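Below is how a single chain appears once it has passed through the pipeline. First comes the sequence as given, then the structure the pipeline wrote out for it. We keep one example in the README because the format questions we get most often are answered faster by looking than by reading.
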Amino acid sequence: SNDEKEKLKELLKRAEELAKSPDPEDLKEAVRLAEEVVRERPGSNLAKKALEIILRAAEELAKLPDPEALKEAVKAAEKVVREQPGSNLAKKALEIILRAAEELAKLPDPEALKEAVKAAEKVVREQPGSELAKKALEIIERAAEELKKSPDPEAQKEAKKAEQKVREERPG
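Resulting structure:
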């Protein structure tokens, strides 16, 4: 249907525009609109173009010291990894995830530190044996080292468990 095709081209046009803005709310909306295109016509050239736009916006959201922006950046980039593994876009997506995790690890809150471990753990499993994986393990260690200072017994248990898997996943 030609009307559907023009509807999705409109979404993509607007997504491209919003991705050019520094405003987090514009960036988040650009991700939403582009993802609608991918959802309606998977595997199409329109959908593949949309993943580039999603990545551009995620790139920008990853820099912000806003925990909500960073979470969105992780979820968005992780979707590019799943859908374009045969493209260099997937590598840039993993680098974006790592940038976001590092940023989360800086935030003064345990829920953010937990999010950093969770994000970096994605990178370990989706690029084992690489420098990205090794850097991700360092972030998990650093974040775990920060969770250690928290008084909560549950956070302290999480930090220990995180440090344990890092050791076992590294060489002797």
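Residues 120 and 136 are 5 Å apart (CA to CA).

See the next section for the split statistics.
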